[PDB]
JSON list of C-alpha atoms in Angstrom, two decimals:
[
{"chain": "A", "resi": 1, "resn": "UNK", "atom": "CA", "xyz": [110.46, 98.64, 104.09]},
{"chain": "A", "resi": 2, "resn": "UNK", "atom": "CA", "xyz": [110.03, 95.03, 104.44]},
{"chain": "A", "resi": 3, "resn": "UNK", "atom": "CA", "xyz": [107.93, 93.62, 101.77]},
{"chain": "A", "resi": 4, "resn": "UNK", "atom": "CA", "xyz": [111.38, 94.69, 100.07]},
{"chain": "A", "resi": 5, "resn": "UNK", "atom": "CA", "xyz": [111.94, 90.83, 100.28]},
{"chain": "A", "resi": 6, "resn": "UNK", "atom": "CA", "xyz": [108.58, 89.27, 100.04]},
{"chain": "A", "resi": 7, "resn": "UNK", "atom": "CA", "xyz": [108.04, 91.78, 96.87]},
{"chain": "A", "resi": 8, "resn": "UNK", "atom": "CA", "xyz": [111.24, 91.70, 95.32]},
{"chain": "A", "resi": 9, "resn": "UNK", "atom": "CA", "xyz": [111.69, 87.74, 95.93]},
{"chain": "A", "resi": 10, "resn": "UNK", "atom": "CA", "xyz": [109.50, 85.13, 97.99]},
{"chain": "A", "resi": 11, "resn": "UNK", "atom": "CA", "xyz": [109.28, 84.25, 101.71]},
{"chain": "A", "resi": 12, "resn": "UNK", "atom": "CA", "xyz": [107.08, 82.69, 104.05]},
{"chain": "A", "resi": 13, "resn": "UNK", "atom": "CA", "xyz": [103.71, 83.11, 105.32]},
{"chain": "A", "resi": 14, "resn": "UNK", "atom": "CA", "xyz": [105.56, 82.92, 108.90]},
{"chain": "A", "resi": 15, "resn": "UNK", "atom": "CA", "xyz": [108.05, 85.63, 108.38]},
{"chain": "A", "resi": 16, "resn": "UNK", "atom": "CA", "xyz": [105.31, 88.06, 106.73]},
{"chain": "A", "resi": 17, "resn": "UNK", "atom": "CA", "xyz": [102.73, 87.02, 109.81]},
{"chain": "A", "resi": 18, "resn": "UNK", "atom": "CA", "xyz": [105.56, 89.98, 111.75]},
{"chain": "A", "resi": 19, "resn": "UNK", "atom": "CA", "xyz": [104.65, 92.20, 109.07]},
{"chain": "A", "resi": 20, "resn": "UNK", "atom": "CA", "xyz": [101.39, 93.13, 111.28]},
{"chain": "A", "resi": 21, "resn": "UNK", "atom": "CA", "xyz": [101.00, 96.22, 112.25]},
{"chain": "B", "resi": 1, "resn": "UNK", "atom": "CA", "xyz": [101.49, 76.93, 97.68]},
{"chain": "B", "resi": 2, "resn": "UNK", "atom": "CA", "xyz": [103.24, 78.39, 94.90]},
{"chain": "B", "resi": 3, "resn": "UNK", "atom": "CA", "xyz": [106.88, 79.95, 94.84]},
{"chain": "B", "resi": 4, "resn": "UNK", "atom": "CA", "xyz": [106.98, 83.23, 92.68]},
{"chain": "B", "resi": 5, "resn": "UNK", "atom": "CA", "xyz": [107.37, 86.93, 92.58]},
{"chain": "B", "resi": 6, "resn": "UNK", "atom": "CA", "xyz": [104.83, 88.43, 95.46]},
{"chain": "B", "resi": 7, "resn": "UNK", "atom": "CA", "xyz": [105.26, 91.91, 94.61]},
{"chain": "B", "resi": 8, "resn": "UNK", "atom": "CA", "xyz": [101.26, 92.27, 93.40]},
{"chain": "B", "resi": 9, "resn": "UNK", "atom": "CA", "xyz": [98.19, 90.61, 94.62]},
{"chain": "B", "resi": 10, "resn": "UNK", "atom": "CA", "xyz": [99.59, 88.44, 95.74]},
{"chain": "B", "resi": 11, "resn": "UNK", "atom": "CA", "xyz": [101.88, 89.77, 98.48]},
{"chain": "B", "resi": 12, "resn": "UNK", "atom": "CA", "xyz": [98.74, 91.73, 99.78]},
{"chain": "B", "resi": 13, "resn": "UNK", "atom": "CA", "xyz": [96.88, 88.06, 99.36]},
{"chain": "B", "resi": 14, "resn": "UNK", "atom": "CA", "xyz": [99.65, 87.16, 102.04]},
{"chain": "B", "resi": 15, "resn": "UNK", "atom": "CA", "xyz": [98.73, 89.43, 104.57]},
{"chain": "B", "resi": 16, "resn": "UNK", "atom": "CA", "xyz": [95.50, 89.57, 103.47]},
{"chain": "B", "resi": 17, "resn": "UNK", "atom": "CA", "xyz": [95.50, 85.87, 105.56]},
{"chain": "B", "resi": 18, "resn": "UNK", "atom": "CA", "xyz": [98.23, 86.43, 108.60]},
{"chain": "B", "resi": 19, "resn": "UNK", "atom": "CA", "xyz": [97.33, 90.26, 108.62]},
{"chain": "B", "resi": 20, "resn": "UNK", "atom": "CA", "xyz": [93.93, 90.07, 107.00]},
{"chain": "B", "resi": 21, "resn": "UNK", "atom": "CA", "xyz": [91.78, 92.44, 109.79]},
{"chain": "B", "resi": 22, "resn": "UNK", "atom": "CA", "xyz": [95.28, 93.45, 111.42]},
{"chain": "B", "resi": 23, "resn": "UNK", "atom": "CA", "xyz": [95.72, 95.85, 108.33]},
{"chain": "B", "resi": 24, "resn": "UNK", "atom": "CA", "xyz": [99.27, 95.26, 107.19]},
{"chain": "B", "resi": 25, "resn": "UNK", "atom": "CA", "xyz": [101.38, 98.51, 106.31]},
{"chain": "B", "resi": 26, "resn": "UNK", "atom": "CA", "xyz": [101.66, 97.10, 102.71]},
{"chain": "B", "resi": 27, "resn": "UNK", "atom": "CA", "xyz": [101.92, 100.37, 101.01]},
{"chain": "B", "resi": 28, "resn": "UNK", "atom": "CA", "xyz": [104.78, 101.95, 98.94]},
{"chain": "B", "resi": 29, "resn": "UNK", "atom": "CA", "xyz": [108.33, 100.76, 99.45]},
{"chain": "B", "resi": 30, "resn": "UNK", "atom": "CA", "xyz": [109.20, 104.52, 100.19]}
]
């Protein structure tokens, strides 16, 4: 559920470092 | 860096770095 931008478009290594889990 | 689709290796790739041993909940957009 938030890959849905990443995956479906392109962001940056500093918005997908929250994507830790 | 490169700007293009990331749904497929490459999106993993991302987290692979940031969340590489953090395991990133990458799985199905459910």
């Amino acid at each position: 559920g938030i890959v849905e931008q990443c995956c479906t478009s392109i962001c940056s290594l500093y918005q997908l470092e929250n994507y830790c889990n | 860096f490169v700007n293009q689709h990331l749904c497929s290796s490459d999106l993993v790739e991302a987290l692979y770095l940031v969340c590489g041993e953090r395991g990133f909940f990458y799985t199905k957009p459910t």
